[PDB]
Symmetry: C3
Subunit: 306 residues, 3 copies
């Protein structure tokens, strides 16, 4: 069993400095030794260096860094595609969540029937026409879903992106901070999600059961786990850019990762939005990074009963 | 779709200074804008000034400030009754919980078939003969329940009170610090409650289902939500006079408010016992006040899924 | 009902200084008054002074203080046996968990059909041949289970110990940090346990129901509750030697204890591994001690509804 680890130190999907140090923080929290201990054969691609784009002016006087986000994701997609083709499950360390454009596009290149479990406080599904921030880390899903493309204009640097995945092939877990246009999109296209309220009602066990029934109930499919650290309650993951009270507990996050592992289908994992500079203390940064490692390790078989 | 906001900066139901700054603290945490954003048409009555009573000696060498508490609640009931009479859902910001004598009396004056959801670590149902503290914020329910009245002596300043609500019309949620005579009262009058232990067993979804079955399962009734901030765990609401370990989580609190909103029957709400002076830090004070705003906003339609 | 309280200030089942002050910390947090208030008639045995053993060299160049742990547990077992013989429910305050060798042996002497509820982040079931630490507080169960005795070598100071419990007669709750050889032992001898993951799935009410079904579903048996304070999440019980993230909540711990009390069969209880010196602050030490008192008190009838 082989795992590729890719550092994607990208910050231009949003405006807060420091998320580009996420990959180093996660590495320094002991990721590689944790993965080896589970028996993973590891290939470390290091931290990628993304080609900058000169004069990357705002798109439509609103969307920030469109060409840089587009080119960095193009280059990342190529690495992910290559790594999956050589048989690695792909761990990508962010960096802001706009990198999912690249990891999912690269993943889907030769696994077009993949499915997506998006663990996040946010739906990240604004389009360039609905985003009120202009930050591409809050729009990545809009570029990936086939049903949405008549409503998604073409951004400079984005022409290489072919929407691959159907709206029936992504399930959200942990939502609690959704813009009204995103809520409209989720309803209008019948995208399935389990908000914190649904977890409050159902419990995380039934949530995972219904997630896998929706996605792999009829056939086995490679799973793409896109895990935004801010799905966890801010008391557990303070060092992140958009913290929202009322998040997953530690045990709930582990349970999600455990069930991901238990399918046997995990093919790529994003761990994004760890920003150590937003911690008010070194300890706050380290617990956030330590939590990111716990998620990744549990997703590749670390158990709580030994 | 109209909401009145009444500040009741009362502290004489108990002995700790500062709870009279609850209303200002909750307002400064952004309450009015949050209510407006939901579509509430707002009438702000400001903070009331209550008439002092000269020589308000202890009653029976035990009950403190009886006439002041009686008169303040008489005046508050007057304001609540006119606001409900003019079509407003009434939000009253405390202040100690003795002001529920006034808000429920004033509410019932216009809506006599109301029912009460009392969210609290405490039962607040001591009578003047069972209280061991003498503080009227630990007795408000005893003055309101019709079946208890033969055991409730008449206090100076209380003769205006018409206790007509039945013991079958109030349900408690969150109990975990109950005096032995309060436990006797709850059992002897078959008053229904969901303690923290019941929530542990049933889960908050079934707690709310069973609460509404008891109160509105036979007919629609206006709902009075009386919410003591100390129902929440002290880690979440530290700035309060009688914190008790092992309380509601944030998510459980939001879920209660959400189900209150979902009935469509919320007619008045109390948010009581925020005392910002008991915070050990400005952070603890603001967290408690922000939590209070979250409870109120969720009770009037704020969702976690947008 | 009569309760004996035995301080067992023992630290040589492990290497960290200060767990011998656990009994004094728990007493200072009000234990005796809490138990009296529940109506329990109290016999206080004080803190035992265990006989030292000169030249207590490592066994097999690994196992630390074997003769001291053997002899202290022999002396403790004698005291527990006498107290249980005299009709006391036995509360033993630790001290590290190697003292369960003594309390369970003494308890089993008069009550051979006793069953064991072991509440703990750890399984404590390494043998002298599987421990990687050499610390006897991580091995006590191996000396007590009949089915394991052909694989447990005899230690200096241990020859008095007769395995008294069958592997069907112990249930674990709270496991989350299990060594591979312990996991093998648990599965190979079909020892029943509820890990944190099981609690996440079932909820603590179902966990307790199944616990008692396994243990006393056929017949009434005296219950021995061996409660390692590190079963609780470290945010709640920080002053302990091997804290593990993702533990019991406060409410779950109270619920376990309440259900223990509700059987009416509690005959002895260990409250072990409070180490006040590992607190980074006086408050951290006191919160841990207060929690220990809450466990013991709820195990003997303290309720959350009064
Ligand atoms: N909907 C928002 C947006 O900007 O589109 C409005 N504010 C935050 C949220 C984006 C969160 C980005 B994520 O952290 O989840 O990668
Ligand atoms: N039962 C008590 C009483 O004084 O009657 C004994 N101690 C506090 C409790 C009252 C709590 C008042 B509430 O905060 O719930 O408004
Ligand atoms: N399995 C271990 C061992 O040393 O055997 C490895 N690390 C700690 C654990 C013992 C915990 C002892 B307890 O605290 O539960 O009394
Ligand atoms: Mn997010
Ligand atoms: Mn995201
Ligand atoms: Mn209260
Ligand atoms: Mn109250
Ligand atoms: Mn132990
Ligand atoms: Mn332990």
């Amino acid at each position: 069993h082989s795992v590729a680890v890719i550092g994607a130190p990208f910050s231009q999907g949003q405006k807060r400095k420091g998320v580009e140090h996420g990959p180093a923080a996660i590495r320094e929290a002991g990721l590689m030794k944790r993965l080896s201990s589970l028996g993973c054969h590891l290939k470390d691609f290091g931290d990628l260096s993304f080609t900058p784009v000169p004069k990357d002016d705002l798109y439509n006087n609103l969307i920030v860094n469109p060409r840089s986000v587009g080119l960095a994701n193009q280059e990342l997609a190529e690495v992910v595609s290559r790594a999956v083709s050589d048989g690695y499950s792909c761990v990508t360390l962010g960096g802001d969540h706009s990198l999912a454009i690249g990891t999912i596009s690269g993943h889907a290149r030769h696994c077009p029937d993949l499915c997506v479990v998006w663990v996040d406080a946010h739906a990240d599904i604004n389009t360039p026409l609905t985003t009120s921030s202009g930050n591409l880390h809050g729009q990545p899903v809009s570029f990936l879903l086939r049903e949405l493309q008549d409503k998604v204009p073409q951004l400079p640097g984005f022409s290489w992106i072919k929407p691959c995945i159907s709206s029936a092939s992504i399930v959200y877990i942990g939502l609690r901070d959704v813009d009204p246009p995103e809520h409209f999109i989720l309803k209008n296209y019948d995208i399935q999600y389990f908000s914190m309220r649904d977890i409050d009602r159902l419990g995380i066990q039934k949530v995972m059961e219904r997630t896998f029934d929706l996605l792999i109930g009829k056939r086995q499919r490679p799973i793409h786990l896109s895990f935004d650290i801010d799905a966890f309650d801010p008391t557990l993951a303070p060092a992140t850019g958009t913290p929202v009270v009322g998040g997953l507990t530690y045990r709930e996050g582990m349970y999600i990762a455990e069930e991901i592992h238990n399918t046997g289908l995990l093919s790529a994992l994003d761990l994004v939005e760890v920003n150590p500079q937003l911690a008010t203390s070194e300890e706050e940064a380290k617990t956030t990074a330590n939590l990111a490692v716990d998620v990744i390790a549990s997703s590749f078989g670390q158990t709580r009963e030994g």
